[PDB]
């Protein structure tokens, strides 16, 4: 519980972090990459800002650290998702002054200007993308409007695809006139648009058109899974939506019974659609660390789900070391 | 007082310390000590509930019979290495609610 | 010039010259290239082939299809074949190498004086008229035996007199003076430099033995706990480091430097395997992908665990990881080794067995072996011999009666108790009874357990075992043998009905003090009404005092073996008493969690089975465990209250 362990001499640690940030912002952006030095220094820098969650930082030090992390940190070692994770864990609750939000918005503006070309793909590992940066910006300042990105979307045409989709993914932080300008440019047609827009609040319900689209995607996934079964390839994409689809049936968000006809596609699908017939043998004791509040209580609200979840949780408590299972067990299931 | 270690899963303080003993009946015992045996896997076929097989040594060899539960008090208690620790023993004897708060060499047979 | 990988093959590196090893390995397979070789040198190739197949170098890295190395130790000392080494020592030596292994075997049987003398003889007879390997080895072993003798004499005659009463002085004083005089300022660092210059070029690989610390492999062991998500390069090196020291008859296998990294390799390996498991379960599934832990103990693993680990180290192994998930391979070989240990123990005590250095060296491995025996399914005859040895021929100065009972309860976890084992335990109890006729004899135990637990275990495994021998001894009792009557009181269920009838008249029940004395020794099973009335007067006396055993009475009432109802009139005072007699009207604000730390499995089971207190107790436990890190409260909460 390192977060509860006190830290001493915070000024010296701040100076150390500022020196590290200065070194990375000078060496890696002044044609001095120094591949000989790029073997042990980045390992120290990688482990530096990770362990900076538990140390309080001043406004200037925080600004320097965030700028060095977002802008000049090489993409070879840190991708977009890791950068977002580290920025999230570097700014605690109500610890985001205006300058840091401005720096994040400048990063988003640079990213948007980097997406003019259709060749750029913005690969990642954990799947977190710039939409998560927008969520972070909006979390600490809900009534935050943007001016640079609003200016960019006010000079946009419905001819390309990457820039419009990118700005739509970060629609909440756009002005009202900019929002009206962008919405007519791209509507919600495919399933990925629905997935992107369900987290930012344009659509509050699941009108039968969206359910029919989900069913069509499920049928396509069914034929593809049959093809793979003939081929014998277990393709589990990082950006699949089976868990996201099943996340709503358990909450009564989707009333279509047709989902019950796709039982057996993916373990989480059976877990969240038909708990009674689910085989509590393939249950991965790691999904339980990815549901914050709307699911843990709802999972504990079932007659035939606790009587199998509690055994898994007890086993994970007894011969492991993770402290998440302990508080999960004593917070919702007891 | 550097040899006192508190044990958690059984409410006991382990300390190589000898205490004079005064009980309700007139029989009085000189400095002695206790040995507790935390065994939650003990054969308790009869109406046995205690997880601790607590017994007493008088002089490291003289194990006295249990008989009735003597209402013992710590009296003068010596660590036998540094100095008398009477207060240091009596002050943590309360707020324990477990018999024989201070013993020596818990065997911990699991 | 060549990296000889421990997995069996060899890989090239820094061979700036010709690739002699590659060409040799190529001709190892081609018969024509073998045939084209010259006649005078063909026998040399055959000798090289024999050596390279013995050392375990199979082939090159480009064709290393088969690499599983089956470790084989043929040393007599490793398997503890004492009967063989004694016969070999009695046999006269025909050569020097045979004399060398006779010296080493004499060193492992504790006869260090004879071993030192025979090493001196070898040194005299092999000054330099050889390749010098035997002369070098017998100089190092001589110094190591001298160090061991000095350490033993500074400890056995130094402080351990109470381990045998009076100083047994295993080494004669004149012999001690002689070895001190013959070994004044013996430079061991420079010994290798004193060898002929030809020797220092040929046997350069024997340099580490003349060093104060030579096994600096522990720095490599830090790779076993790296958390990057193999370990077989360490186990194979361990066997590589055991087939050298134990097969070349070297006296560096009993020191603390050797025992320290064996206790560190075998602990780190099992801990890391325990971490490979319980981590793949997180993202792969409990049983869909959790086939096995990964580690597989074998004969040469159990032998190391027996020989080098201590009891506390074994307990640390069990507390950290679940060894029960690690199957023990080669059950028959472990059974035979354990039977051999039992035979050695039986033959040691029955004979003179005054020789104490070997006793101390061997009792540790004997105890560790009979400790780890619980994980191996032992055969019926083997288990019978093991138990007989452990009960009737194991010295009491090392294993007390309580530890002895713990050892059997440990052995009976993984195996049943057929008629032979219970018969052996019955004979042991009979021997204890015959020893108890001496009124001046008392049991000494450092575990709290006593002879009562043996009868309790027998009754638990066999509910109707009536020891007719004990019944006859009870029948032949007299009044003056008070201690015998007390001991037979401790074993009441094992006596016959007529024996019980004759015994109960000797000591009746009295008031409450004797009542509880009988309850502790299990004199009464069903609470007779007379006992019940006696109880009330104690409580009625308590009321007068109020205007102890009260918790015991409350717990008995809660367990429904006390059926008196007028005691319901006597509530509203102690917290635990009201808790266990009237859960309906208890105000729970006075409950103390510490009570739950004194309750065995069955009491907590009965508590959890009752509706009126389950929620209150579980919420109390949750509140207590939220604000503290106590593992006992969580353990109770998860085992019984879920």
């Amino acid at each position: 519980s390192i977060d509860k362990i006190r830290f001493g001499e915070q000024e010296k640690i701040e100076e150390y972090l500022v020196g590290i940030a200065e070194e990375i912002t000078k060496q890696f952006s002044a044609n001095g990459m120094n591949v000989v030095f790029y073997t042990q220094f980045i390992s120290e820098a990688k482990a530096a800002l990770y362990f900076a969650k538990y140390v309080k930082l001043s406004e200037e030090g925080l600004g320097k650290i965030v700028k060095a992390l977002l802008f000049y940190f090489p993409e070879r070692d840190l991708d977009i998702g890791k950068r977002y994770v580290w920025l999230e864990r570097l700014t605690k609750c109500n610890e985001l002054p205006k300058s840091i939000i401005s720096i994040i918005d400048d990063f988003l503006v640079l990213q948007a200007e980097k997406h003019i070309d259709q060749n750029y793909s913005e690969v990642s590992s954990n799947g977190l993308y710039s939409r998560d940066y927008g969520a972070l910006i909006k979390h600490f300042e809900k009534n935050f409007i943007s001016k640079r990105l609003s200016e960019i979307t006010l000079c946009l045409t419905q001819d390309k695809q990457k820039q419009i989709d990118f700005l739509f993914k970060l629609l909440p932080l756009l002005s009202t006139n900019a929002k009206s300008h962008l919405l007519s440019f791209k509507s919600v047609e495919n399933i990925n648009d629905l997935m992107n827009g369900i987290r930012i609040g344009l659509i509050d319900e699941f009108t039968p058109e969206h359910e029919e689209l989900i069913i069509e995607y499920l049928e396509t996934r069914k034929v593809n899974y049959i093809v793979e079964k003939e081929k014998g390839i277990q393709t589990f994409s990082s950006n699949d939506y089976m868990s996201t689809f099943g996340i709503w049936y358990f909450l009564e968000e989707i009333n279509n019974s047709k989902m019950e006809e796709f039982i057996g596609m993916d373990d989480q699908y059976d877990f969240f659609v038909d708990p009674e017939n689910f085989d509590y043998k393939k249950f991965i004791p790691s999904w339980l660390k990815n549901y914050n509040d709307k699911l843990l209580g709802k999972i504990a609200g079932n007659k035939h789900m606790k009587h199998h979840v509690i055994e898994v949780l007890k086993e994970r408590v007894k011969n492991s070391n993770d402290k998440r299972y302990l508080e999960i067990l004593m917070n919702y299931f007891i | 007082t550097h040899d006192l270690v508190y044990h958690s899963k059984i409410n006991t303080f382990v300390w190589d310390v000898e205490f004079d003993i005064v009980l309700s009946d007139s029989k009085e015992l000189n400095k002695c000590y206790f040995v507790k045996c935390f065994n939650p896997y003990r054969i308790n076929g009869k109406c046995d509930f205690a997880v601790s097989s607590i017994d007493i040594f008088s002089e490291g060899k003289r194990l006295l019979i249990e008989n009735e539960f003597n209402f013992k008090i710590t009296k003068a208690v010596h660590v036998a290495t540094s100095k008398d620790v009477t207060e240091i023993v009596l002050h943590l004897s309360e707020r324990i609610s477990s018999p024989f708060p201070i013993v020596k060499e818990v065997v911990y047979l699991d | 010039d060549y990296h000889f990988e421990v997995n069996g093959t060899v890989v090239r590196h820094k061979n700036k010259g010709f690739g002699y090893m590659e060409r040799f390995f190529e001709l190892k397979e081609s018969c024509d290239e073998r045939s084209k070789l010259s006649k005078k040198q063909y026998e040399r190739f055959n000798a090289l082939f024999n050596f390279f197949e013995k050392n375990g170098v199979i082939c090159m890295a480009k064709d290393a299809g088969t690499l599983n190395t089956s470790i084989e130790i043929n040393s007599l000392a490793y398997h503890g074949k004492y009967d063989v080494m004694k016969k070999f020592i009695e046999e006269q030596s025909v050569s020097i190498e045979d004399d060398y292994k006779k010296a080493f075997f004499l060193a492992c049987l504790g006869r260090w004086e004879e071993s030192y003398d025979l090493y001196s003889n070898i040194i005299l007879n092999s000054i330099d008229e050889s390749n010098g390997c035997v002369y070098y080895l017998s100089q190092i072993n001589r110094y190591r035996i001298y160090q061991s003798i000095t350490q033993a004499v500074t400890q056995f005659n130094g402080l351990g007199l109470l381990t045998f009463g009076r100083h047994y002085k295993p080494f004669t004083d004149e012999f001690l003076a002689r070895i001190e005089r013959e070994m004044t300022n013996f430079n061991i660092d420079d010994l290798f430099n004193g060898m002929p210059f030809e020797f220092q070029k040929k046997y350069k690989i024997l340099e580490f033995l003349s060093d104060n610390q030579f096994l600096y492999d522990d720095t490599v062991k830090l790779f076993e706990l790296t958390n990057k998500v193999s370990d077989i390069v360490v186990l194979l090196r361990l066997y590589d480091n055991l087939r050298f020291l134990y097969e070349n008859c070297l006296w560096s296998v009993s020191f603390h430097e050797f025992h320290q990294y064996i206790r560190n390799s075998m602990s780190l390996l099992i801990e890391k395997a325990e971490y490979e498991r319980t981590r793949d379960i997180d993202e792969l599934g409990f049983s869909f992908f959790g086939k096995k832990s990964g580690f597989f103990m074998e004969y040469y693993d159990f032998v190391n665990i027996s020989r080098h680990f201590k009891i506390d180290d074994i307990k640390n192994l069990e507390r950290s990881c679940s060894i029960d998930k690690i199957r023990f391979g080669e059950q028959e070989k472990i059974e035979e080794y354990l039977v051999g240990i039992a035979e050695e123990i039986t033959k040691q005590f029955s004979a003179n067995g005054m020789n104490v250095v070997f006793y101390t060296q061997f009792i540790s491995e004997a105890k560790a072996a009979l400790y780890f025996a619980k994980y191996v399914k032992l055969s019926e005859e083997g288990l019978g011999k093991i138990v007989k040895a452990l009960l009737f021929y194991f010295p009491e100065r090392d294993l007390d009666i309580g530890k002895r009972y713990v050892w059997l309860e440990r052995l009976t976890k993984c195996n049943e108790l057929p008629k032979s084992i219970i018969s052996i335990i019955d004979d042991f109890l009979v021997l204890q009874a015959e020893k108890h006729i001496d009124q001046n004899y008392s049991e000494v135990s450092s575990n709290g357990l006593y002879s009562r637990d043996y009868g309790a275990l027998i009754k638990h495994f066999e509910k109707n075992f009536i020891s007719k021998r004990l019944s006859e001894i009870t029948l032949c009792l007299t009044q003056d043998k008070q201690k015998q009557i007390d001991f037979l009181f401790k074993l009441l269920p094992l006596l016959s009905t007529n024996a019980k009838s004759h015994l109960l008249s000797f000591k009746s029940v009295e008031n409450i003090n004797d009542l509880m004395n009988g309850i502790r020794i299990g004199l009464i099973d069903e609470f007779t009404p007379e006992h019940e009335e006696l109880i009330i007067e104690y409580l009625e006396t308590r009321k007068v005092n109020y205007i102890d055993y009260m918790s015991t009475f409350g717990i008995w009432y809660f367990l429904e073996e006390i059926n008196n109802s007028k005691m319901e009139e006597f509530i509203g005072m102690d917290d635990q008493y009201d808790f266990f007699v009237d859960p309906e009207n208890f105000d729970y604000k006075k409950f103390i969690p510490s009570w739950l730390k004194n309750y065995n499995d069955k009491l907590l089971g009965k508590i959890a089975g009752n509706k009126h207190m389950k929620h209150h107790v579980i919420e109390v436990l949750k509140e207590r465990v939220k604000n503290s890190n106590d593992k006992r409260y969580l353990e109770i909460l998860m085992n019984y209250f879920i």
Side-chain angles (χ1 to χ4, degrees), chain A residues 234 281-286 310 314-323 325-326 329-330 334, chain C residues 274 277-279 281-288 618 622 625-626 629 634-635 637-639 642:
Chain A
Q234 269 172 10
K281 175 158 301 308
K282 321 199 268 314
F283 181 55
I284 292 285
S286 288
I310 59 182
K314 261 156 51 148
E315 172 260 308
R316 285 322 300 170
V317 167
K318 275 152 102 182
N319 40 347
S320 160
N321 271 356
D322 211 320
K323 327 278 296 194
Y325 302 134
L326 199 33
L329 190 132
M330 286 138 30
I334 276 175
Chain C
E274 174 46 3
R277 192 209 144 200
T278 74
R279 188 64 17 201
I281 306 190
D282 268 357
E283 87 273 32
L284 257 52
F286 184 16
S287 49
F288 197 32
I618 189 186
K622 185 197 92 94
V625 78
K626 169 214 200 303
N629 258 354
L634 166 146
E635 191 39 50
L637 181 132
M638 311 185 328
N639 277 353
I642 294 176

Side-chain angles (χ1 to χ4, degrees), chain C residues 276-324:
Chain C
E276 269 183 17
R277 192 209 144 200
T278 74
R279 188 64 17 201
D280 270 42
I281 306 190
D282 268 357
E283 87 273 32
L284 257 52
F286 184 16
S287 49
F288 197 32
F289 274 81
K291 169 56 196 170
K292 274 317 305 171
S293 286
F295 207 46
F296 193 49
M297 316 272 267
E298 293 265 76
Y299 175 63
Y300 295 131
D301 266 347
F302 178 87
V303 160
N304 294 331
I305 297 264
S306 272
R307 195 170 322 263
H308 309 86
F309 272 67
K310 295 302 210 303
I311 288 184
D312 43 358
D313 303 316
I314 286 176
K315 287 164 166 5
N316 293 328
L317 249 198
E318 293 170 358
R319 287 169 181 171
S320 60
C321 85
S322 79
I323 293 124
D324 45 21

Side-chain angles (χ1 to χ4, degrees), chain B residues 47-94:
Chain B
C47 307
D48 312 358
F49 42 110
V51 315
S52 46
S53 306
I54 166 61
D55 80 51
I56 50 195
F57 299 63
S58 172
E59 263 60 59
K61 153 66 192 82
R62 264 311 301 161
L63 161 85
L64 302 65
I65 81 194
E66 146 187 301
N67 206 300
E68 84 283 14
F69 194 10
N70 319 333
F71 294 150
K72 331 205 153 187
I73 38 166
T74 174
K75 286 292 302 180
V77 46
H78 312 8
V79 66
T81 53
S82 298
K83 110 174 60 181
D84 155 30
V85 303
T86 298
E87 314 316 87
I88 296 169
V89 155
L90 57 90
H91 189 21
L92 303 321
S93 158
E94 321 96 321

Side-chain angles (χ1 to χ4, degrees), chain B residues 10 12-17 19 32-39 42 51-64 72 99-109, chain C residues 445-450:
Chain B
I10 195 61
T12 278
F13 295 74
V14 174
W15 207 4
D16 159 3
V17 77
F19 29 62
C32 69
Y33 53 56
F34 317 136
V35 160
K36 196 158 300 181
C37 156
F38 180 82
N39 190 206
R42 180 168 178 118
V51 315
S52 46
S53 306
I54 166 61
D55 80 51
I56 50 195
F57 299 63
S58 172
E59 263 60 59
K61 153 66 192 82
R62 264 311 301 161
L63 161 85
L64 302 65
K72 331 205 153 187
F100 315 93
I102 287 87
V103 313
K104 100 181 298 203
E105 288 313 309
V106 181
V107 307
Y108 253 119
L109 196 292
Chain C
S445 64
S446 56
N447 207 1
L449 304 153
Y450 274 127

